[PDB]
Amino acid sequence: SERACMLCGIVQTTNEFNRDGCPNCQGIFEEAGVSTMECTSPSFEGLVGMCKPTKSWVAKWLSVDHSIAGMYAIKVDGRLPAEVVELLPHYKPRDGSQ
Amino acid sequence: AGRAALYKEVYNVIASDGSYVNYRHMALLVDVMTTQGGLTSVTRHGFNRSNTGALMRCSFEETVEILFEAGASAELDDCRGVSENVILGQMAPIGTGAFDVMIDEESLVKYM
Amino acid sequence: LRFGEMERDCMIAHGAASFLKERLMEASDAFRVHICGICGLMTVIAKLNHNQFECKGCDNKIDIYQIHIPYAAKLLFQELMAMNITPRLYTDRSRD
Amino acid sequence: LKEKAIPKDQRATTPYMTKYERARILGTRALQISMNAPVFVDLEGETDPLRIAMKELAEKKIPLVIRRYLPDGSFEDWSVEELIVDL
Amino acid sequence: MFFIKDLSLNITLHPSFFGPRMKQYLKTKLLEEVEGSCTGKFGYILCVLDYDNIDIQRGRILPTDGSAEFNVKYRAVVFKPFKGEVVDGTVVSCSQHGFEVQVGPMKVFVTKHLMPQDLTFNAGSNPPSYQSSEDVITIKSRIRVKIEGCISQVSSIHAIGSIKEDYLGAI
Amino acid sequence: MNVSTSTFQTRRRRLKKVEEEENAATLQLGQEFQLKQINHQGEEEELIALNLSEARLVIKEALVERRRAFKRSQKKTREKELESIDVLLEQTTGGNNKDLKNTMQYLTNFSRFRDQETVGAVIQLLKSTGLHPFEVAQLGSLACDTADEAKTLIPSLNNKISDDELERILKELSNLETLY
Amino acid sequence: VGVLAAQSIGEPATQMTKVTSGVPRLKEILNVAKNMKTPSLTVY
Amino acid sequence: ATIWGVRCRPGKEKELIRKLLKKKFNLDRAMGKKKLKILSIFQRDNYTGRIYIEAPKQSVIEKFCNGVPDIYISQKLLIPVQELPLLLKPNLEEVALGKTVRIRSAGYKGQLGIVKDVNGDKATVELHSKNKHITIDKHKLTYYNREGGEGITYDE
Amino acid sequence: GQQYSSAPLRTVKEVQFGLFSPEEVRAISVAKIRFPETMDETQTRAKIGGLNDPRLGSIDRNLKCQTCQEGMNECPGHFGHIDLAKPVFHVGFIAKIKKVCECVCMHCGKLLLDEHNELMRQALAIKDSKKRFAAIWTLCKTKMVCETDVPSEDDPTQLVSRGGCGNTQPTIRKDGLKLVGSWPELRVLSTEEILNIFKHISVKDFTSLGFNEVFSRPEWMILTCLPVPPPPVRPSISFNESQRGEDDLTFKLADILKANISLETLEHNGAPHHAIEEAESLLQFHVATYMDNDIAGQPQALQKSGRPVKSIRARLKGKEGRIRGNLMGKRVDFSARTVISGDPNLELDQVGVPKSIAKTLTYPEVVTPYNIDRLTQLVRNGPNEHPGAKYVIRDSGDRIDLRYSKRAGDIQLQYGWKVERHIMDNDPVLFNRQPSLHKMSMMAHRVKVIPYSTFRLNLSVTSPYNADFDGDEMNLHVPQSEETRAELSQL
RNA sequence: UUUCUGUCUCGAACCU
DNA sequence: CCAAGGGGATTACTCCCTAGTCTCCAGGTTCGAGACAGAAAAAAAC
Numbered sequence A: 001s002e003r004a005c006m007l008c009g010i011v012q013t014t015n016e017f018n019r020d021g022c023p024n025c026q027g028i029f030e031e032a033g034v035s036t037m038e039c040t041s042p043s044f045e046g047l048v049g050m051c052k053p054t055k056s057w058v059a060k061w062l063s064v065d066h067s068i069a070g071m072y073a074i075k076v077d078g079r080l081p082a083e084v085v086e087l088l089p090h091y092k093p094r095d096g097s098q
Numbered sequence B: 001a002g003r004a005a006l007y008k009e010v011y012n013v014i015a016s017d018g019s020y021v022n023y024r025h026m027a028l029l030v031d032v033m034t035t036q037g038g039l040t041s042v043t044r045h046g047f048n049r050s051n052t053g054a055l056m057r058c059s060f061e062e063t064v065e066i067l068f069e070a071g072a073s074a075e076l077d078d079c080r081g082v083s084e085n086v087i088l089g090q091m092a093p094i095g096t097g098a099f100d101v102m103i104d105e106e107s108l109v110k111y112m
Numbered sequence C: 001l002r003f004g005e006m007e008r009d010c011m012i013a014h015g016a017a018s019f020l021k022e023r024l025m026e027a028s029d030a031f032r033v034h035i036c037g038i039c040g041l042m043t044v045i046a047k048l049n050h051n052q053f054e055c056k057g058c059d060n061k062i063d064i065y066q067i068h069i070p071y072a073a074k075l076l077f078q079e080l081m082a083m084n085i086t087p088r089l090y091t092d093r094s095r096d
Numbered sequence D: 001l002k003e004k005a006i007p008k009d010q011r012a013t014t015p016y017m018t019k020y021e022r023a024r025i026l027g028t029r030a031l032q033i034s035m036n037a038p039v040f041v042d043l044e045g046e047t048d049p050l051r052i053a054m055k056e057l058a059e060k061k062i063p064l065v066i067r068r069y070l071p072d073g074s075f076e077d078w079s080v081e082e083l084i085v086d087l
Numbered sequence E: 001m002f003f004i005k006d007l008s009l010n011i012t013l014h015p016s017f018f019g020p021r022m023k024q025y026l027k028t029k030l031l032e033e034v035e036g037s038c039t040g041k042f043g044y045i046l047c048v049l050d051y052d053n054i055d056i057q058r059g060r061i062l063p064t065d066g067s068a069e070f071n072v073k074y075r076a077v078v079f080k081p082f083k084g085e086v087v088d089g090t091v092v093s094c095s096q097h098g099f100e101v102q103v104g105p106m107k108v109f110v111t112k113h114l115m116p117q118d119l120t121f122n123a124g125s126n127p128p129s130y131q132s133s134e135d136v137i138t139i140k141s142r143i144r145v146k147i148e149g150c151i152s153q154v155s156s157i158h159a160i161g162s163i164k165e166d167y168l169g170a171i
Numbered sequence F: 001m002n003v004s005t006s007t008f009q010t011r012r013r014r015l016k017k018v019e020e021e022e023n024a025a026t027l028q029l030g031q032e033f034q035l036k037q038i039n040h041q042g043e044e045e046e047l048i049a050l051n052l053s054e055a056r057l058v059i060k061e062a063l064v065e066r067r068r069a070f071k072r073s074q075k076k077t078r079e080k081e082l083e084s085i086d087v088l089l090e091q092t093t094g095g096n097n098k099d100l101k102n103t104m105q106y107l108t109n110f111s112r113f114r115d116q117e118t119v120g121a122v123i124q125l126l127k128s129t130g131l132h133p134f135e136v137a138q139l140g141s142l143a144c145d146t147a148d149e150a151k152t153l154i155p156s157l158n159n160k161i162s163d164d165e166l167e168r169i170l171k172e173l174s175n176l177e178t179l180y
Numbered sequence G: 001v002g003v004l005a006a007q008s009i010g011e012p013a014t015q016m017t018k019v020t021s022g023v024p025r026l027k028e029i030l031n032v033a034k035n036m037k038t039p040s041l042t043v044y
Numbered sequence H: 001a002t003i004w005g006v007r008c009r010p011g012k013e014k015e016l017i018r019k020l021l022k023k024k025f026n027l028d029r030a031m032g033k034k035k036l037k038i039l040s041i042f043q044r045d046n047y048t049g050r051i052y053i054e055a056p057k058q059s060v061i062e063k064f065c066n067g068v069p070d071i072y073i074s075q076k077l078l079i080p081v082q083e084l085p086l087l088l089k090p091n092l093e094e095v096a097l098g099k100t101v102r103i104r105s106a107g108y109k110g111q112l113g114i115v116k117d118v119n120g121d122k123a124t125v126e127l128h129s130k131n132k133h134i135t136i137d138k139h140k141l142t143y144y145n146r147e148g149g150e151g152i153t154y155d156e
Numbered sequence I: 001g002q003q004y005s006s007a008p009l010r011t012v013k014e015v016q017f018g019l020f021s022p023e024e025v026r027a028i029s030v031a032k033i034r035f036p037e038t039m040d041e042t043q044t045r046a047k048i049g050g051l052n053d054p055r056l057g058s059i060d061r062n063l064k065c066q067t068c069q070e071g072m073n074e075c076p077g078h079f080g081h082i083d084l085a086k087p088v089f090h091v092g093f094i095a096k097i098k099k100v101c102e103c104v105c106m107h108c109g110k111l112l113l114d115e116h117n118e119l120m121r122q123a124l125a126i127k128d129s130k131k132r133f134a135a136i137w138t139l140c141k142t143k144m145v146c147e148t149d150v151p152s153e154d155d156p157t158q159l160v161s162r163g164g165c166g167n168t169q170p171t172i173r174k175d176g177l178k179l180v181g182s183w184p185e186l187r188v189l190s191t192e193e194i195l196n197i198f199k200h201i202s203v204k205d206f207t208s209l210g211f212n213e214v215f216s217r218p219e220w221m222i223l224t225c226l227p228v229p230p231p232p233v234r235p236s237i238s239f240n241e242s243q244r245g246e247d248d249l250t251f252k253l254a255d256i257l258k259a260n261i262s263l264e265t266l267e268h269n270g271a272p273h274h275a276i277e278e279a280e281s282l283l284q285f286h287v288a289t290y291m292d293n294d295i296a297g298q299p300q301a302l303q304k305s306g307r308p309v310k311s312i313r314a315r316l317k318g319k320e321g322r323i324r325g326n327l328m329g330k331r332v333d334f335s336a337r338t339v340i341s342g343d344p345n346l347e348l349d350q351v352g353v354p355k356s357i358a359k360t361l362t363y364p365e366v367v368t369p370y371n372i373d374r375l376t377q378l379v380r381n382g383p384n385e386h387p388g389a390k391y392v393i394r395d396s397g398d399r400i401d402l403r404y405s406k407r408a409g410d411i412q413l414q415y416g417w418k419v420e421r422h423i424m425d426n427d428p429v430l431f432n433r434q435p436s437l438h439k440m441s442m443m444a445h446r447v448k449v450i451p452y453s454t455f456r457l458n459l460s461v462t463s464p465y466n467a468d469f470d471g472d473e474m475n476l477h478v479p480q481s482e483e484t485r486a487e488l489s490q491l
Numbered sequence J: 001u002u003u004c005u006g007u008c009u010c011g012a013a014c015c016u
Numbered sequence K: 001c002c003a004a005g006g007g008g009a010t011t012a013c014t015c016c017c018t019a020g021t022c023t024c025c026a027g028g029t030t031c032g033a034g035a036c037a038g039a040a041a042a043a044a045a046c
């Protein structure tokens, strides 16, 4: 059921992903022309529920301090779409690769 | 004087109930308990702290501790003793293993 | 039946060393143990059917000795080698 | 090394036979006779190997010797014929 | 290499064999056990000397078994090869890899890379032979080889040899 | 494997791994091969060596002694000596043991001395040298003609015998070779 | 000898029924104890 | 940072996180301005049986985790500041046998028995009267069918 | 087992003790163990690589060990080994590790003292290993720094450069299964550093302590490669086929292997250095409870059923333990126990034996011309009546059962054979009363076969036995050899 | 003409 | 001049106090209950 976003790590239930997906990266998915189900992956890990990404040092470590409070996964298996990868040069893989 | 007084105590405690034991048994008891410099107590910490065979020593109270000390200090357990020969299941030099038995090739040939 | 410590003592007093040997080896449990001369360990891969004797780990094929010991003594030694202690058994005297 | 061995002279152990030596010798002769060794004495119908052994010891016709181990490893070498089995 | 050393062996004999002839019996068995044997540790045991004066040490009755263990002391002539000594032998058999040379009770193998340039194989003769510019190696020919390595098996010894230095080969 | 053979040198071989020295010609002998050997009666003497002829001679003395013992027990020029040796060995052993046969052929056909007096004389002359028994056995057994050839034969024996005494022993051996 | 001494000293101990005596005293003797229940001294 | 690791029951860690957040969100929905100060909570699969939580003071985690099963609030420890980049790095992890018989020339005559074994010429019978086994020659026993009646001698 | 071997037959007459090296264990092991599951995977018993690996020993009557091909009767079991991913303290020697650490430098690996101290020379004069180590350690506790030089007796001002590190030596304290060192920057001493310093100890240095270079160096006092017992040391037990329970030791071994594979994965993958610390602590704890279940101030390992797990220390520990319960005193056949009754019509040295007990107990008598007729008669009679035998041992060594052989009379007793004839009258048999308080409580008596269910013994022999016929029971041991009979009759 | 089963482990009660 | 002289301020040892091991006969005989159990994932096949 529940899945994790490959791009930035947000975790929500399958119904929530069908409803709105990633509000943090809905724009990036819309430009890249890829829906959320293909960017999300079933195997994930490191699920931190951030309430204050601006002040939290964990959010700075995981590069999510600029976004809104919620789930963010340190490890999200799979390979993000190449189109999104080129659209995000500063993005680096969250599964330890590269 | 310690050996003499100790024999005197053992004689007293034995003869209190009227039983008589031969002197040489008490003498051996005190002499083993005094063969070292001081009084080797017949205890976990006494005679079994001496330097006999490790397999003999381990059969008394501290088994595994003495075996570890034997492994660390690399003791050559003598096998001249009862408990080690019993552990090995061979004729301990008790009274019958105190010698060997041979064949007179000489006299076996001399008669015939 | 069992041959307790006290009865072992009584036989030790009697002097029947042959009795004790027979009673604690042949009548109880006798195990043949091949050992290597260099190491003196129970590590001999004895193929009596093929008569092929070797203690690998010392490379020898010629200096191998059987002993008769109780299975309890065998398996004490196995526990000691499981517990990082060496039961070593040899063909000589050194102190003399 | 033979130097530990004592020659036939200068032996300090008792010629009088010990009960343990007697018992071992009777047993050893008993195995030998029970397993078809030659018998050194005329047999008057005796059939128990222990009895045959006692008879041979009585006549001092037992071909056996004893190394009498001195506790240092040396030994005194004593023949059954010469060992005075008094008891 | 043909020396005399004092050794000793323990022989296990049965109560059943205690007549006055047990000595001649024990001896036939001694020769049975030592004549023709070989060991890595001591080498090849070729013969036993001074039979009539062998000091037979006295036996040992086993503590519970009836058997008698006699440790027999004796001196004997043994042979054992060492790397680098040069010895002579006879060709016993040929093949494409070289030829085996019989030296005493052992065979010496001369590998192809340690053989002279000018000396090579030739199967036009029956049996195949080896020819050189100044030498002729064949079955019935005596040759001098240097032992380079020894391999000791359970009941055998093997030697590897070479022929390169001066005065070696056909003699 | 089988009943091995014992030895008198009660070395300190307790637990020791493979530490055997190399076996080469440079006097780095094995653990048994000291210059000093133990005796029958606990005595210590030097290792004794012998040439091929002395080896065959002691073998023959042993064999004829065995034949005399066997007879007592049951009582109550390259063409003839070889046959005598052959029939002696056949009468001695059963025949299945070829090992003695092959060795005896190997020794008969390229030994040099044949006489007790000659082999005795050789050993008396080598006694004065006092060199190492294996090495003197080599000088008495293998044939040499020049100092350089001898030294490359036995690189160990380089600064042990000077040239003149080396040549004397060489020509003496060459003269003492028997003409068959 | 030693086992003989052991049995001969232990046999009266089992049938063993002022100063201390009996099995408590024998245990005290063999287990050389610095503390002593009823130490005594006889000065002539 | 302030990061404390708490022992918990192995294998259920995600269920613990999900329950903890649902409690937190319900607490936020019920509570107004003054919310609980829990910066975030997470777990680790391969270091199973353990949770990591950030919060300023221990009383916050106590007042959060009261009533939460399968967490050992008593068992908590400081994570060192130097240890955090390595913890948060992305790249981690015989027909006569058995027959009724009657004995005929012996002291046990007229007695039923059951043949147990036959060693040849001598049959062992357990007596159908006495708690004892007896050997007796099988020829001299009269055998009976499964029920009583006619007695047949040894001719079968 | 029984089979014609070829190595020399002899007895052991020494036991040298020591510790294995990991190289020794690797050399001696026949198989490497890496899979914690023991068997039952894919429904094949031969689980290659796991516990109970068939190369270690035959788990059943398969007739094939595949290391020796000897069958379970004869195969002595062959040791496995497991390279632990990090070195582990050995519980028995942990105090000795502490003592050596107080004795030597933790960096330069040299004894804090040397022959330049008079107290140290006097300590070193002691010949005995144990007392010498005790003196060395009592002298080395006081020093708390690896000094770079000592005053020399030649002049006070001139000092000798004895060498070594300059650092201060820690005070070491015991916390559970680990050593903490305080310099105070307190920290747990890593087993890696302790192993490295032990290996760096010099030869004279540790030989000066109670160690030897071939027997046991302090370096191998720490466990880097655990040897695993073969199946004969860890036999399975079974309700029926459906439920087979493995041994406590097998479960501890599997648990250790799970801890080690987890630690190896944690090493190979990302290494946080605190979870690896936790896994190292767990694996040390598991090895510790495996080898010793009586740690001071630490919880005992509990088995799946909640009782304490049976460790090797426990299997050697007490009276039930192996030394006192299977070696000093053990069990034996050819024996009987039953009630005793008085009997004044019996000779003093005679003892009455029930007919049944005589029928079961046997003496192996060898066939000679001197008893061939009586032995053939006994065999013909067979085991059912008293004068007779049960077994006939031929020359090849195989036993034939006379009760199951119907051609018993047809068997001819060739020579050298044996028969297990029932004990007849006038047979020496030891007679013992179980409270063997003293020497005369075990005496050899002559059998008198006597038809009844109770041992009868002469009344005057009740005093040395301390017997009373008030429900007492006594113990009859039948000798099995001519030596044994001769000893019992003459001694 | 087809045979050498098979156990542990925690206790309880009783006998000498 | 002198000859001690009381500590400075560390050495050196010495001698006394609390917390942790490891028992506590020599044996037999029957008798009984217990080999967690819960839960979820992979595989079977109605």
Ligand SMILES: [Mg+2]
Binding pocket: I467, I468, I469, I470, I471, I472, J016
């Ligand atoms: Mg009573």
Ligand SMILES: [Zn+2]
Binding pocket: C036, C037, C038, C039, C040, C041, C043, C055, C056, C057, C058, C059
């Ligand atoms: Zn070995």
Ligand SMILES: [Zn+2]
Binding pocket: I056, I057, I065, I066, I067, I068, I069, I070, I075, I076, I077, I078
């Ligand atoms: Zn095997």
Ligand SMILES: [Zn+2]
Binding pocket: I105, I108, I109, I110, I145, I146, I147, I163, I164, I165, I166, I167
């Ligand atoms: Zn230092």
